[PDB]
Amino acid sequence: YLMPWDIVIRTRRDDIARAFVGFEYEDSRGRRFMCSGPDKVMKVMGSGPKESALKALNSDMPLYILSSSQGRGLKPHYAQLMRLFVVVPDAPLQIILMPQVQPGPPPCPVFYPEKQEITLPPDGLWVLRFPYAYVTERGPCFPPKENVQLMSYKVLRGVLKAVTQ
């Protein structure tokens, strides 16, 4: 599922446009799930998601989360944030995408696409695919080892901005 993002157009059902957002994690076995915040795997039982996207958009989303399966092995399985889903409504607003990723603790650099600000066209279900591996001039930013604080591996808050026209 994707989280509802209710955007106010004018400071009636006509004053609020509804977008949808989903942060997709993928594990090494190809299992996929959406998160509704840093420590919360989204689970919908019944008539759709109750959780607002505004919480996830205003928080740093972790690049790695523990996969919800106990494998028959001693090693923790991480799922990586691989995709961002965005439903842009047909409404007088601009949705701007600004993806920034920090794949490790400071002084680790921040990675971003070659186009830093991307205005998404109206009436569209869009998917941004994040890099699988991150590499600097000093070499690769390796995935977290056993005993590393996952909070240092993150997609920075503010990945999406809405601007009313």
UniProtKB/Swiss-Prot annotation:
The modification Omega-N-methylarginine is found at R72. Signal peptide: none annotated. Phosphorylated by SMG1. The modification Phosphoserine is found at S69. Involved in nonsense-mediated decay (NMD) of mRNAs containing premature stop codons. Is recruited by release factors to stalled ribosomes together with SMG1 and SMG9 (forming the SMG1C protein kinase complex) and, in the SMG1C complex, is required to mediate the recruitment of SMG1 to the ribosome:SURF complex and to suppress SMG1 kinase activity until the ribosome:SURF complex locates the exon junction complex (EJC). Acts as a regulator of kinase activity. Belongs to the SMG8 family. Component of the SMG1C complex composed of SMG1, SMG8 and SMG9; the recruitment of SMG8 to SMG1 N-terminus induces a large conformational change in the SMG1 C-terminal head domain containing the catalytic domain. Forms heterodimers with SMG9; this assembly form may represent a SMG1C intermediate form. It is linked to Alzahrani-Kuwahara syndrome: An autosomal recessive disorder characterized by severe global developmental delay, impaired intellectual function, poor or absent speech, microcephaly, and facial dysmorphism. Additional variable features include early-onset cataracts, hypotonia, lower limb spasticity, and congenital heart malformations. This is Nonsense-mediated mRNA decay factor SMG8. It comes from Homo sapiens. The gene is SMG8.
